[PDB]
Coordinates of C-alpha atoms in Angstrom, one line a residue:
Chain A
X1 CA -9.6 3.6 -12.1
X2 CA -12.0 4.3 -15.0
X3 CA -14.9 6.8 -14.2
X4 CA -18.7 5.7 -13.7
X5 CA -21.4 7.3 -15.2
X6 CA -24.3 7.6 -12.9
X7 CA -27.2 9.2 -13.4
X8 CA -29.4 10.3 -10.2
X9 CA -33.1 12.1 -10.8
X10 CA -35.2 14.1 -8.1
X11 CA -38.7 13.9 -8.9
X12 CA -38.5 17.4 -11.3
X13 CA -34.5 17.0 -11.6
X14 CA -31.6 15.5 -13.1
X15 CA -28.6 14.6 -12.2
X16 CA -25.4 13.1 -14.7
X17 CA -22.4 12.7 -13.3
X18 CA -19.2 10.2 -12.0
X19 CA -17.6 9.4 -8.6
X20 CA -14.6 7.0 -8.0
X21 CA -15.2 3.5 -8.3
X22 CA -14.1 2.4 -4.9
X23 CA -16.8 4.9 -3.6
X24 CA -19.6 4.7 -0.7
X25 CA -23.7 4.9 -1.3
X26 CA -23.1 8.2 1.1
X27 CA -20.7 9.9 -0.7
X28 CA -23.1 9.4 -3.9
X29 CA -26.0 10.5 -1.4
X30 CA -24.2 13.4 0.8
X31 CA -23.4 14.6 -3.0
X32 CA -26.8 14.5 -4.6
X33 CA -27.8 16.6 -0.8
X34 CA -26.4 18.9 -1.5
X35 CA -26.1 19.6 -5.2
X36 CA -29.5 19.9 -4.8
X37 CA -30.0 21.9 -1.0
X38 CA -31.9 19.4 1.0
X39 CA -31.5 18.6 4.5
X40 CA -34.0 16.9 5.6
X41 CA -32.4 13.7 4.5
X42 CA -33.7 11.1 6.6
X43 CA -36.7 10.6 4.6
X44 CA -35.0 10.1 0.9
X45 CA -33.0 7.0 -0.4
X46 CA -31.5 6.2 -3.9
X47 CA -33.5 3.8 -5.7
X48 CA -32.2 1.4 -8.2
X49 CA -33.4 -1.6 -9.9
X50 CA -31.0 -4.8 -9.8
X51 CA -30.8 -8.0 -11.5
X52 CA -32.9 -10.4 -10.8
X53 CA -35.6 -6.9 -11.8
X54 CA -35.9 -5.6 -7.9
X55 CA -36.3 -1.9 -7.2
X56 CA -34.5 -1.9 -3.6
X57 CA -32.4 1.1 -1.8
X58 CA -29.2 1.6 -2.0
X59 CA -27.0 1.2 0.9
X60 CA -25.2 3.8 2.5
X61 CA -22.2 1.8 4.2
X62 CA -21.1 -0.2 0.6
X63 CA -19.9 0.7 -2.6
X64 CA -22.2 1.7 -5.4
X65 CA -20.7 -1.4 -8.1
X66 CA -20.7 -3.9 -5.4
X67 CA -24.3 -4.5 -4.2
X68 CA -26.2 -5.7 -7.2
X69 CA -26.5 -2.6 -9.2
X70 CA -28.0 -3.4 -12.8
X71 CA -24.7 -2.5 -15.0
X72 CA -25.5 -0.4 -17.6
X73 CA -24.1 3.3 -19.2
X74 CA -24.7 5.7 -17.1
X75 CA -26.0 3.8 -13.7
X76 CA -29.5 5.1 -13.1
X77 CA -30.4 6.0 -10.0
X78 CA -34.0 8.1 -8.3
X79 CA -33.6 10.1 -5.4
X80 CA -36.8 9.7 -3.9
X81 CA -38.9 9.6 -0.1
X82 CA -38.3 6.3 1.2
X83 CA -39.5 6.8 4.6
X84 CA -43.1 8.7 5.0
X85 CA -43.9 10.8 8.2
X86 CA -46.7 10.2 10.2
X87 CA -48.3 13.9 9.6
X88 CA -46.9 15.7 6.6
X89 CA -48.1 19.0 8.4
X90 CA -45.2 19.1 11.0
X91 CA -42.5 16.8 10.0
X92 CA -42.0 18.4 6.4
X93 CA -40.4 21.4 7.0
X94 CA -38.8 22.9 4.3
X95 CA -40.2 23.6 0.5
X96 CA -37.8 21.3 -1.3
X97 CA -39.1 18.5 1.0
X98 CA -42.7 19.4 0.1
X99 CA -42.5 19.5 -3.3
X100 CA -41.0 16.6 -3.6
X101 CA -43.2 14.5 -1.6
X102 CA -45.9 15.9 -3.5
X103 CA -44.5 14.9 -7.0
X104 CA -43.9 11.3 -5.8
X105 CA -47.1 10.9 -4.2
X106 CA -49.1 13.0 -7.2
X107 CA -47.0 10.7 -9.4
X108 CA -47.8 7.4 -7.7
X109 CA -51.2 8.0 -7.5
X110 CA -52.1 9.5 -10.8
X111 CA -50.1 5.5 -11.7
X112 CA -52.6 3.8 -9.3
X113 CA -49.9 2.3 -7.6
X114 CA -51.9 3.8 -4.5
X115 CA -55.8 3.6 -4.8
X116 CA -57.6 7.1 -4.8
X117 CA -61.5 6.9 -4.9
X118 CA -63.0 9.1 -7.7
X119 CA -64.0 12.5 -5.8
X120 CA -61.3 12.6 -3.6
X121 CA -58.8 12.2 -6.8
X122 CA -60.7 15.1 -8.5
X123 CA -60.4 17.4 -5.1
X124 CA -56.3 16.1 -5.1
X125 CA -56.3 17.5 -8.8
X126 CA -57.5 20.9 -8.2
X127 CA -54.1 21.2 -5.9
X128 CA -52.6 20.6 -8.0
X129 CA -53.5 22.6 -10.3
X130 CA -54.0 25.2 -7.6
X131 CA -50.1 24.6 -7.2
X132 CA -48.8 24.4 -10.8
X133 CA -51.3 27.4 -12.1
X134 CA -51.7 29.3 -9.4
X135 CA -55.1 31.5 -8.9
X136 CA -57.9 30.9 -11.4
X137 CA -58.2 33.7 -13.8
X138 CA -61.3 33.5 -16.0
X139 CA -59.6 35.9 -18.5
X140 CA -56.4 34.1 -19.0
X141 CA -57.7 30.1 -18.0
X142 CA -59.6 29.9 -20.8
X143 CA -61.7 26.7 -21.2
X144 CA -59.5 23.7 -22.4
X145 CA -56.6 25.0 -19.9
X146 CA -56.8 21.7 -18.3
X147 CA -56.1 19.4 -21.6
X148 CA -52.9 19.4 -21.9
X149 CA -52.9 18.0 -18.2
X150 CA -52.9 14.9 -16.7
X151 CA -54.9 14.9 -13.8
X152 CA -57.0 11.8 -13.0
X153 CA -55.8 8.7 -11.9
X154 CA -56.1 6.2 -14.7
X155 CA -58.5 3.8 -13.4
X156 CA -61.2 6.5 -11.8
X157 CA -61.5 8.0 -15.9
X158 CA -62.2 4.1 -16.5
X159 CA -64.8 3.2 -14.1
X160 CA -66.2 6.9 -14.3
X161 CA -68.6 7.3 -17.2
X162 CA -67.4 11.4 -17.9
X163 CA -66.5 13.1 -21.1
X164 CA -63.1 14.8 -21.3
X165 CA -64.4 18.2 -20.8
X166 CA -66.5 17.5 -17.9
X167 CA -63.9 16.0 -16.0
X168 CA -61.6 19.0 -16.5
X169 CA -65.1 21.5 -15.9
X170 CA -65.3 19.3 -12.5
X171 CA -61.5 20.4 -11.5
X172 CA -61.9 23.7 -12.4
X173 CA -64.9 24.1 -10.6
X174 CA -63.0 23.5 -7.0
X175 CA -59.8 25.0 -8.5
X176 CA -61.8 28.6 -8.5
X177 CA -62.5 27.6 -4.8
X178 CA -58.5 27.4 -3.7
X179 CA -57.8 31.1 -4.7
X180 CA -55.4 32.7 -2.7
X181 CA -53.9 29.1 -1.5
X182 CA -50.0 30.0 -2.7
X183 CA -47.6 27.2 -4.1
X184 CA -46.4 25.9 -0.7
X185 CA -50.2 25.3 0.9
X186 CA -51.7 23.7 -1.8
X187 CA -48.9 21.0 -2.4
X188 CA -49.8 20.6 1.4
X189 CA -53.0 20.3 1.5
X190 CA -53.2 17.9 -1.5
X191 CA -50.4 15.6 0.9
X192 CA -52.9 16.1 3.6
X193 CA -55.2 14.2 2.0
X194 CA -53.3 11.9 0.6
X195 CA -51.3 11.0 3.7
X196 CA -54.8 9.2 4.8
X197 CA -55.7 7.0 2.2
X198 CA -55.1 3.4 2.8
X199 CA -52.1 2.6 0.3
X200 CA -50.1 5.8 0.9
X201 CA -46.4 5.1 2.3
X202 CA -46.8 1.3 2.5
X203 CA -44.2 -0.7 1.5
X204 CA -45.5 -3.9 -0.4
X205 CA -43.7 -7.6 -0.8
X206 CA -45.0 -10.5 -2.2
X207 CA -45.0 -13.2 0.5
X208 CA -46.6 -16.5 1.2
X209 CA -47.8 -18.4 4.7
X210 CA -46.8 -21.8 5.7
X211 CA -49.8 -23.5 3.8
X212 CA -49.1 -21.4 0.5
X213 CA -51.5 -18.9 0.6
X214 CA -50.0 -15.9 -1.8
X215 CA -50.2 -12.7 0.4
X216 CA -48.9 -9.4 0.7
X217 CA -46.5 -7.6 3.4
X218 CA -46.8 -3.7 4.0
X219 CA -44.1 -2.2 5.9
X220 CA -44.7 1.1 7.1
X221 CA -44.3 4.0 9.8
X222 CA -46.5 2.7 12.1
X223 CA -45.6 -1.3 11.3
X224 CA -46.2 -3.9 9.8
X225 CA -49.1 -5.8 8.5
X226 CA -50.0 -8.4 6.4
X227 CA -52.6 -8.8 3.5
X228 CA -54.9 -10.6 1.3
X229 CA -53.7 -11.1 -2.5
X230 CA -56.2 -8.9 -3.8
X231 CA -56.9 -6.7 -1.1
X232 CA -54.2 -4.5 -1.0
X233 CA -56.0 -1.0 1.1
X234 CA -57.2 -3.5 4.6
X235 CA -54.6 -5.7 6.2
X236 CA -56.3 -8.8 7.5
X237 CA -53.7 -8.7 10.7
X238 CA -51.8 -5.6 12.0
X239 CA -48.2 -5.9 13.4
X240 CA -47.8 -1.8 15.9
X241 CA -44.6 -1.5 16.8
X242 CA -46.0 -1.1 19.6
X243 CA -47.2 -5.0 19.6
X244 CA -43.8 -6.4 17.8
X245 CA -41.1 -7.6 19.8
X246 CA -38.8 -9.3 17.6
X247 CA -38.7 -9.4 14.2
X248 CA -36.1 -11.7 11.9
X249 CA -35.4 -13.8 9.4
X250 CA -33.9 -17.1 8.7
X251 CA -33.2 -18.0 4.8
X252 CA -36.7 -17.7 3.1
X253 CA -38.5 -17.8 6.8
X254 CA -39.8 -14.6 8.4
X255 CA -40.6 -14.3 11.6
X256 CA -42.8 -11.8 13.8
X257 CA -43.0 -12.2 17.8
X258 CA -45.4 -10.9 19.0
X259 CA -45.1 -8.3 22.4
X260 CA -47.8 -10.5 24.0
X261 CA -46.8 -13.7 25.4
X262 CA -50.0 -15.8 25.2
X263 CA -50.0 -15.2 21.5
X264 CA -48.6 -17.0 17.9
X265 CA -45.4 -15.9 16.2
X266 CA -46.8 -15.1 12.5
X267 CA -44.5 -16.5 10.3
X268 CA -44.1 -16.1 6.6
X269 CA -42.3 -16.8 3.3
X270 CA -40.5 -14.5 0.9
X271 CA -39.6 -15.7 -2.5
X272 CA -35.5 -14.9 -1.5
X273 CA -32.8 -14.1 1.6
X274 CA -32.6 -11.0 -0.2
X275 CA -36.2 -9.7 0.3
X276 CA -36.3 -10.8 4.0
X277 CA -33.0 -8.6 4.6
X278 CA -34.5 -5.8 2.5
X279 CA -37.5 -6.2 4.8
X280 CA -35.6 -6.3 8.0
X281 CA -33.8 -3.2 6.5
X282 CA -37.1 -1.1 6.3
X283 CA -38.6 -2.1 9.3
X284 CA -35.7 -1.6 11.1
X285 CA -35.6 2.3 9.4
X286 CA -39.1 3.1 9.8
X287 CA -38.7 2.3 13.7
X288 CA -35.8 4.2 13.8
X289 CA -37.6 7.7 13.1
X290 CA -40.9 6.4 14.8
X291 CA -38.7 6.5 17.9
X292 CA -36.8 9.4 16.8
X293 CA -39.9 11.9 16.5
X294 CA -40.7 10.8 19.9
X295 CA -37.6 12.2 20.9
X296 CA -37.4 16.4 21.4
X297 CA -36.1 17.5 18.2
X298 CA -32.8 18.0 17.1
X299 CA -30.9 21.7 17.5
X300 CA -31.3 20.9 13.9
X301 CA -34.5 20.4 13.2
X302 CA -35.9 23.0 16.3
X303 CA -34.3 25.5 14.1
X304 CA -35.3 24.5 10.5
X305 CA -39.1 25.0 11.7
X306 CA -38.0 28.1 12.9
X307 CA -36.8 29.5 9.6
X308 CA -40.1 28.3 8.2
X309 CA -42.1 30.2 10.4
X310 CA -40.1 33.1 8.5
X311 CA -40.7 32.2 5.2
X312 CA -44.4 32.2 5.6
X313 CA -44.2 35.1 7.5
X314 CA -45.8 38.3 5.5
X315 CA -44.7 41.2 7.8
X316 CA -41.8 43.7 7.1
Chain B
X1 CA -21.5 -17.4 8.0
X2 CA -24.5 -16.8 8.6
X3 CA -28.3 -16.4 6.5
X4 CA -29.8 -14.9 9.4
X5 CA -30.9 -11.8 10.9
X6 CA -33.0 -10.1 13.7
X7 CA -33.8 -7.1 15.3
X8 CA -35.1 -6.6 19.0
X9 CA -37.9 -4.2 18.3
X10 CA -38.7 -3.8 22.3
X11 CA -35.5 -3.9 23.2
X12 CA -35.0 -0.6 21.0
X13 CA -36.8 1.7 23.5
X14 CA -33.6 3.3 24.9
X15 CA -35.8 6.1 25.3
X16 CA -35.4 5.0 29.5

């Protein structure tokens, strides 16, 4: 059989190679995972674009080429965080996990995919500079050191009237105060502030209700939420896992059956059947981890948290 | 031949 060109990219890597034409998604995954030395695999997946212009997640069970993968050379893939923990502090154990979450989240905030207010964005920026350059040194980090760096969301630079050097001074002032903070600590402090942002870790889906009004369905670690089309920060209606008895779809109709037997089922419409299938898969994947983290840590996890306790110690 | 799907959120709690 003729080999297929695949190119899985990490937030800070690029992995080009070939596999068997009749190879599963888990084989590609298990390969990417080992090449990179990632063990907390449960937060990740391989994202790809299809024939309709959608960015979904590779199914591990099926063959790579069978699930609608945009045909090209090489076959573009992206190793990314698919699930976000409820608390980054106690759930992202290893350094490689933390680094990958940091880069993806930072990339998303910078691209304006996740909203961030101006002051918070600057504070985030300084943690990013502290993480890249390390301790601020007046002698080496001479004025203009942050001129080649993209630090703020494009939309905060536009909504706020400050010159280029002024913004760089705001971030510099914060950088100075982070002295002593290691890279791992700096990225985690970044993620700690980022995880409280309204749009962080939310998977948005363009939907419509019975009437026809355009809405947004958001799927995250805690449940489902319906948003008004021009407001993706504040949910108009929320559905925590604890208030949902059942979730299902019928062609283009998705139904959320509440626990309260006196409340009406929430019904929405997706543009296509594939959307509803992906919506249910994500919900199940998030609820799965929601349950998993509420059950005692696996022997493997207990050991990783024990290994990180050592890699953070400064004693001989 | 079914273009449907369902998941029992409440029922999944095998915690018991």
